[PDB]
């Protein structure tokens, strides 16, 4: 048992909630917060942008010594990295960005990082503004995360799309 409240059980390790992953990472403490990153841990906007905003920034302070430290992560690539006030831990993951022109191949790959993990809260990978196909993001989630994983949905209308298309 969990305290992730009203999830929509998609499968039998893969739930959605029309919900802002930061209030419910607020809320929950999650052991573990995905990130939607980008290669340079720079949190502009997004779920990226809107959660290092909630962390006063400390988030993009810890993300930019790891780079001067580490050097750019991969696409479909991960790191492990403080949670902050949101979670004990942020999986900072790399879905390919449609608008870099980024393989969607590689959407498979961000989400196997997940599968390190036990329970995840996590936004639906490359959705928004990355500019993928969400029907088909959450698709890969479901056929590729094994681990138990609650998706938050922020935009009520995607939402409402990805449940009724859901196969
Ligand atoms: O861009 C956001 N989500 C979309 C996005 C963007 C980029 C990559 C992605 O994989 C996704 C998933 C998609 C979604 O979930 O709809 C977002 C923005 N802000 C939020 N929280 C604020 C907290 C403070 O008050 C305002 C809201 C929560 N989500």
């Not at 400390?58 to 696409?75: C, F, H, R, W």
């Not at 196909?133 to 479901?142: F, G, N, Q, T």
């Amino acid at each position: 048992v969990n305290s992730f409240s009203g999830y929509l059980k998609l499968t039998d390790n893969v739930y959605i909630k029309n919900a802002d992953i930061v209030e419910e990472a607020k809320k929950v403490k999650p052991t573990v917060v995905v990130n939607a990153a980008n290669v340079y841990l720079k949190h502009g906007g997004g779920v990226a942008g809107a959660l290092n905003k909630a962390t006063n920034n400390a988030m993009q302070v810890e993300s930019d010594d790891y780079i001067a430290t580490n050097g750019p992560l991969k696409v479909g690539g991960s790191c492990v990295l403080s949670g902050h006030n949101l979670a004990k831990h942020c999986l900072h993951v790399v879905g390919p960005n449609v608008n870099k022109g980024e393989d969607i191949q590689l959407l498979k790959s961000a989400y196997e990082n997940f599968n390190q993990h036990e329970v995840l809260l996590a936004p639906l990978l490359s959705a928004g503004i990355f500019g993928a196909d969400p029907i088909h993001s959450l698709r890969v989630c479901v056929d590729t995360v094994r681990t138990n994983v609650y998706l938050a949905v922020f935009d009520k209308n995607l939402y409402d799309k990805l449940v009724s298309s859901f196969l």
